């Protein structure tokens, strides 16, 4: 319903940076935060997404664009309605957005599959 | 003109409804390009406009007619036609906007709403979530009337939004999932109306993601499982396509 990304800033080439996005709004409240999928973008390119899991093995599952696989990682803390984007070996300068939606999460790598968007945050390598 | 499929709520039976959905599916996809036993919808790319849409004409016992336009690439409703009026959801992009111009040129009055077709927006306007909006032959009959009388200002926007949610589920979703077709069949057989349970709703939410996982799956096995809900709301995950064969009927095209 409402997302604010932070952590943006200026980094030296080959360094690391962690972006943060916290979600809040009516309906969280079925439609809990846990029932929403989240996705990072940066035209706009797909960076990576995340889905929550209550199964036995993981508390969540992630999905990373190929170009980013061996560098960026995504995690989250469900109880704090927060998702993270860990960026290692920066090169990559852009505005990073976080999106969310019932149709978002893993396997949703398109901007139209997310119904809610954040203001974005600037990352300059 | 595009292909028209007919249906009426008057005297409807499990069989008339089933014939209708099967006919819709038949017109939505070539049937070619099947993956893991599941037909895949035409690629939106390079798709000739004269093949982009199909039409669904609905009537009820009050002798009223409305015609829905579906996009064959995702089986979703993009707009409709009632008498001398045709209305359209807000397109996601310019190409889609350009595409829908080819629809219902048959009429003078062409309107485009400020809102899109996503459930979230329609539920907001409706003032009700999918879980609280009854489905069945009864609701569909009433949905058709509302869509029909919208040019008079007599049917309010919430009622219109609720009607869009009913039509989309009983048509678009039914076409996508044998499961949901069977959900309407059960309602129609026993002539009851009732809202969709969490298993229907989560499948609706996940259709795009399920399609993606199946077509990119390593010979059926998903890279990472997808989480759904049972009728009682309890959660569970799926790890491969095999469990979905009797459930999903169409998929949105993806690479490869
Ligand atoms: Cl138009
Ligand atoms: Cl291929």
Swiss-Prot record, chain B:
Its biotechnological use is: A deglycosylated form may be linked to monoclonal antibodies to produce immunotoxins exploited in cancer treatment. However, a point mutation should be introduced to eliminate vascular leak syndrome, a side effect resulting from endothelial damage.
Q: Which residues are glycosylated?
A: 6, 232
Active site annotated at which positions?
Answer: 76, 119, 173, 176
- The organism's superkingdom is given as Eukaryota
Where is AMP bound in this sequence?
76-77, 117-119
UniProt binding sites for a carbohydrate: 4-6, 11, 46, 137-142, 191-193
**Catalytic activity line of the entry:** Endohydrolysis of the N-glycosidic bond at one specific adenosine on the 28S rRNA
Impact noted for substituting residue 70 to A/M: No effect on the toxic activity or the vascular leak syndrome
> Altering residue 93 to A: what's the impact?
No effect on the toxic activity but Suppresses the vascular leak syndrome
Q: What does this protein do?
A: Acts as a glycosidase that removes a specific adenine residue from an exposed loop of the 28S rRNA (A4324 in mammals), leading to rRNA breakage. As this loop is involved in elongation factor binding, modified ribosomes are catalytically inactive and unable to support protein synthesis. Can inactivate a few thousand ribosomes per minute, faster than the cell can make new ones. Therefore a single molecule can kill an animal cell.
Q: What is this protein called?
A: Ricin A chain
Q: Origin organism of this chain?
A: Ricinus communis
In the complete protein, the residues contained here run: 40 to 295 of 576
């Amino acid at each position: 319903v409402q997302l604010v990304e932070t952590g943006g800033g200026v980094v030296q080439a080959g360094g690391s940076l962690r972006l943060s996005c916290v979600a809040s709004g009516r309906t969280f409240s079925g439609r809990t935060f846990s029932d929403h999928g989240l996705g990072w973008f940066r035209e706009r390119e797909f960076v990576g997404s995340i889905s929550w899991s209550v199964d036995g093995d993981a508390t969540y599952y992630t999905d990373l664009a190929n170009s980013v696989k061996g560098r960026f990682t995504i995690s989250g803390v469900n109880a704090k309605n927060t998702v993270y984007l860990q960026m290692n070996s920066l090169k990559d300068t852009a505005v990073y957005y976080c999106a969310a939606g019932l149709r978002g999460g893993t396997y949703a790598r398109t901007i139209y599959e997310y119904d809610y968007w954040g203001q974005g945050t600037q990352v300059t390598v | 003109q595009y292909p028209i499929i007919n249906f009426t709520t008057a005297g409807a039976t499990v069989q008339s409804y089933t014939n209708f959905i099967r006919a819709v599916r038949g017109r939505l996809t070539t049937g070619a390009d099947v993956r893991h036993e599941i037909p895949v919808l035409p690629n939106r790319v390079g798709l000739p406009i004269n093949q982009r849409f199909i039409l669904v004409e609905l009537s009820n016992h009050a002798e009223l007619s409305v015609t829905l336009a579906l996009d064959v690439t995702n089986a979703y409703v993009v707009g409709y036609r009632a008498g001398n009026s045709a209305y359209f959801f807000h397109p996601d992009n310019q190409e889609d906007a350009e595409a829908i111009t080819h629809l219902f040129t048959d009429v003078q009055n062409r309107y485009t709403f400020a809102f899109g077709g996503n459930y979230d927006r329609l539920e907001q306007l409706a003032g009700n979530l999918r879980e609280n909006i009854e489905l069945g032959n009864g609701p569909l009959e009433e949905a058709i009337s509302a869509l029909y009388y919208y040019s008079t200002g007599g049917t309010q926007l919430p009622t219109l939004a609720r009607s869009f949610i009913i039509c989309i589920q009983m048509i678009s979703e039914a076409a996508r999932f044998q499961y949901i077709e069977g959900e309407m069949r059960t309602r129609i057989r026993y002539n009851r109306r009732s809202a969709p349970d969490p298993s229907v709703i989560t499948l609706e939410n996940s259709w795009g993601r399920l399609s993606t996982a199946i077509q990119e799956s390593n010979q059926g096995a998903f890279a990472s499982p997808i989480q759904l809900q049972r009728r009682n709301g309890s959660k569970f995950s799926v790890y491969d396509v095999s469990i979905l064969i009797p459930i999903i009927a169409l998929m949105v095209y993806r690479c490869a």
